[PDB]
Design a protein around this nucleic acid. Structure first.
Length: 115
RNA sequence: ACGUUCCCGGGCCUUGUACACACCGCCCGUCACACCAUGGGAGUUGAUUGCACCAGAAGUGGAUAGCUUAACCUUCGGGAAGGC
């Protein structure tokens, strides 16, 4: 919509189907990784602090704690790097952007389950 | 050449000594040059620890947003218990 019609025509082809999901829910993402001559898939599991929907340019940021330090990656929804996305756990958050979780470390960081 | 007061040496009695190769003795303290152990010393670097907090893995215990329910009860709808 926001883009010109000629641009929209190009974007529609790039669009790829993917399970819809909400903010603040634990998700597992499969990322293509190149080790040279071989291909592998790496699993990234984390709570989704922030999401932005822009049609083709939609992006979601996943935050996970590894060895006591958090890691945040702003994954691209429609990129071909992302082989698949699945929702391990669904949570309810008052606000779309969970930027208070960065300050939170342990017991506070957790998000209540949504039923 | 009165005389023993003195310079020197020698005889005896007593006295004090930290001296005994014996006063031509023994022996004290600073300064100078080395080497040793140590005290204070702006600090530098370790070990162990008092107290006040943050923290909340697995485990057990109270309670239930909720989910799956073999033993017994069932009016076969379910109840009882139990697990997550």
């Amino acid at each position: 919509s926001n883009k010109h019609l000629l641009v929209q025509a190009v974007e529609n082809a790039q669009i790829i189907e993917r399970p819809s999901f909400g903010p603040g829910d634990t998700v597992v993402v499969q990322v293509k990784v190149r080790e040279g001559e071989r291909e592998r898939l790496q699993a990234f599991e984390g709570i989704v602090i922030a999401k932005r929907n822009r049609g083709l340019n939609s992006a979601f940021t996943v935050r996970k704690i590894s060895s006591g330090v958090g890691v945040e990656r702003a994954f691209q929804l429609h990129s071909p790097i992302i082989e698949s996305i699945e929702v391990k756990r669904r949570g309810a958050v008052r606000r779309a952007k969970l930027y208070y979780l960065r300050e939170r470390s342990g017991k506070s960081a957790r998000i209540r389950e949504k039923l």
